Amino acid sequence: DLVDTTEMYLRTIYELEEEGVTPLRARIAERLEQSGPTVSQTVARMERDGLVVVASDRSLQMTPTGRTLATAVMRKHRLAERLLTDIIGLDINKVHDEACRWEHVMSDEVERRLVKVLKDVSRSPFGNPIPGLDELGV
């Protein structure tokens, strides 16, 4: 799905950065288990949508808009993990794969509610901080 695939690329780029890794199409591919030509295809579309630009040095620089989108996806992704662990009680070993799906289907309104019903929305069960809370309106 065009949009969902894009959100996964933006979230992946975000994570790499977060790990201190350089967003390189080959690493994105390797992390996504996808073929180079496929990631190229997708990153091309993404550029045409003004979400990313392959910097002259061939690294992937998220435009301001792409970054805002990548952040909201991660935000949802991480509120989702909190819902799963904190409330639903899902096996911790499944929280991330599930969250990888829900991040595409969760709405802003649900996010705000979760922010209001979860005891803490600072970090995810996995240690990384939950981004964009202020931009969400919570």
Next chain:
Amino acid sequence: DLVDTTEMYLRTIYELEEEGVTPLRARIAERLEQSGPTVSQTVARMERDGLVVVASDRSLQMTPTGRTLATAVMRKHRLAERLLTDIIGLDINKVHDEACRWEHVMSDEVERRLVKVLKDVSRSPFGNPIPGLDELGVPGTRVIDAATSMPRKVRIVQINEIFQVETDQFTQLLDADIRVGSEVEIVDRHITLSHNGKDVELLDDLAHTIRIEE
């Protein structure tokens, strides 16, 4: 997404049926907003997938497999609405739309957990009863499928001795106090049922028939 499409298609046939409406292509198309041709192409696919049959009267008859999937999708859907209203507190005006998306991504594991965590899972906030609960668990899963590379505790639901030819391991299981209800820590390294401190390395036949639920 083809998988998600079929699920939305099946859940809709399910809704009309429940509403007492005849599952007609024009009706479904209208409901899904999509056009009649698109629906025929998508119904054709399902028919080849053995999930639906365009009946005599031209209504859509879900095959058992179709209905089984339709029910599961509706279950996830209504379970999602309970999570959304009871726990999350999402505006009731936005619960249905949200649920139409979540039904495609909520795992069976999340469902069993919601069933445990929700106060009442008999009905959806909108009046209709939540289907497929029995087939969700709250029988069991064939040990061979439930067996993962990492151990975990599971409650025996059925051993199925009546179907066994090879009975050499019957006592082995009895000494290991592994019987109905017995929480045996299983794993896949073949499947080894561990309980009462003992371990029972099952054989293909036993592994397929013994069902451990959750």
